[PDB]
Each structure stands twice: as structure tokens, then as C-alpha cells.
Write a protein that binds this DNA or RNA. Structure first.
Lengths: 142, 142
DNA sequence: CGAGGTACCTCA
DNA sequence: TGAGGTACCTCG
């Protein structure tokens, strides 16, 4: 029932599993499922292509990117299995630690996409989904 | 019947004679009456007092400023008696040449202020007034 | 110039 | 965050 808002294109990269970590300045004790919502900020087409070029390099030439990066909507979820400090991040994930220099790094597993994405208005940090949109989001994960 | 648009507060300082010259990058052969219209850009209260402080220093503590600096209107006129180059300006006006560092300097005498100021939309450089507003402007100088 | 779309900034 | 006022930018 808990959500984090992320700017696109990184938000959809999170729910596809291409982006494996999110960095923030603040810690959370939250573990488990964490819905991912796209903020209202639309990314430029330059921003999308440049960033996709980077993740092709990091992940593989033929990595499959979403056709679209929608704003202001509930995208899917991850399981937040740990919230590591930069120092903990460098010692536990040496092969990906360059992918976030943030003070706190959210380690994500099991990315899931909803095929139908629902409009939503977010809040800072980890915020609670309303029950109506939570129930549809769960049904959207079938 | 020719006009030049100036930003406030300098526009009204011109028609009051507190500001004696105007600097531009471009030369004009125009001589004689030159109406002065304020541009649409409204000046902040800071740039009004700052500039008033400076011209008190240059002209005397008790110099009489206009009560307001209205935008987008015909303010009055000057006689453009010469359009000097920066080199000519330093030669002929040594006591005021610090008051404009522009490539060309409009030398102004005989400032007149209209009592009632008419809305107007300007153009770059020296542009011609429409006859209707010109007849009224001449009438406002009685 | 004047106009207005776009980018930036701040939020009892 | 999302919202919107303000400042900046460009113009057959």
C-alpha cells in the first residue's frame, strides 16, 4: 500500500528492472513491496534517448525498453529488499555501485508492471496509496 | 511625429530633463523633436529608488522626480540636437560623458512632459506616431 | 517593440 | 509532490 514517486524515464526503468537501484538522500526502514508512480514531470525526448543509450551499454545491446514513459501515473512496483548507505552499497554491490552515488540506495528486486496505468498525484518520500487505486493496482498485476 | 521607446524609469527621467542623454548601439540622423514613449516593461520599486538615489547624487539632493513612472504610454518629447559617437561624446561633453558608455549618444535638450499620458505600443528604433495620437500629444503640450 | 511559450522558483 | 506565479527567451 506504499508508494514512491520517481521522475521518468527512470520510473519506468525501475518497474522494468533495467534500473536496479534508486538513490535518495534519506533513509527508509520500509521493506517489501513498494509501488512506483511517475511524477508529473515529463522527460524530453533527448532525455529518453540519451538515457536509453546508457542502459544499453550497461545492460546489453538488445535490452527491451518500454515504448512509452508516461507521467503522473501508477506504473507498477518493486520489492525494496534493503536501504543501504553509500558505504554499504559500495561493499555489497561492487558491480553496480557506480549506478548511484546517493547517500542512501534502495535495492530493488522483482519489478512488476501494470499493463493499465492509473492517473495519480504523488507526495514526497514514501506515501500511502488510497485503497481504491490500491485494489485496482493489485488486480492489474495478474 | 517621430518617437523613441525607452524603459522606465529612464523614460520619464528623460522627459523631466534629469536624464540628459540616451545611449544606443545605432546612429540616427534625426534631429529636432523626438517623442518619448515608455516601453511595456514595468520597473521594480528597487530600480526606481536605486536610480533616484544615483541622480540625486549627480544632480542635487532636492531634485524633483516624477511621482510615478508609467509603462506603455507617450510621456512627452525632447529635441534631439545631436547624435554623437562615444568618442565625440567624450570630447564635447566632458562633465557628463560618464553618464553613457554607448556607441552612439543622443544629446537631448528642451524636455517636455505631457500632463495626460496616452497608451501606446512602440517599435524598435525611431518610429512614427499615428496622426491621431500625435495631434493629441501636441495638444497636451499647451 | 510587444507578445506569449517555456523554464525556473517557491511553497502556515 | 504538484501547483502556479515569475522570469527568461525568442520572434517569415
Amino acid at each position: 500500500s506504499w508508494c514512491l514517486s520517481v521522475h521518468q524515464p527512470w520510473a519506468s526503468l525501475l518497474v522494468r528492472g533495467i534500473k536496479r537501484v534508486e538513490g535518495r538522500s534519506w533513509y527508509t526502514p520500509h521493506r517489501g513491496r513498494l509501488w512506483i508512480a511517475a511524477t508529473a514531470k515529463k522527460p524530453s525526448p533527448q532525455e529518453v534517448s540519451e538515457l536509453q543509450a546508457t542502459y544499453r551499454l550497461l545492460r546489453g545491446k538488445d535490452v527491451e525498453f518500454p515504448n512509452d514513459y508516461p507521467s503522473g501515473c501508477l506504473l507498477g512496483c518493486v520489492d525494496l529488499i534493503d536501504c543501504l548507505s553509500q558505504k554499504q552499497f559500495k561493499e555489497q554491490f561492487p558491480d553496480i555501485s557506480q549506478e548511484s552515488d546517493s547517500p542512501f540506495v534502495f535495492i530493488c528486486k522483482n519489478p512488476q508492471e501494470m499493463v493499465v496505468k492509473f492517473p495519480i498525484k504523488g507526495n514526497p518520500k514514501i506515501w500511502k496509496l488510497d485503497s481504491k487505486i490500491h485494489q485496482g493496482a493489485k488486480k492489474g498485476l495478474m
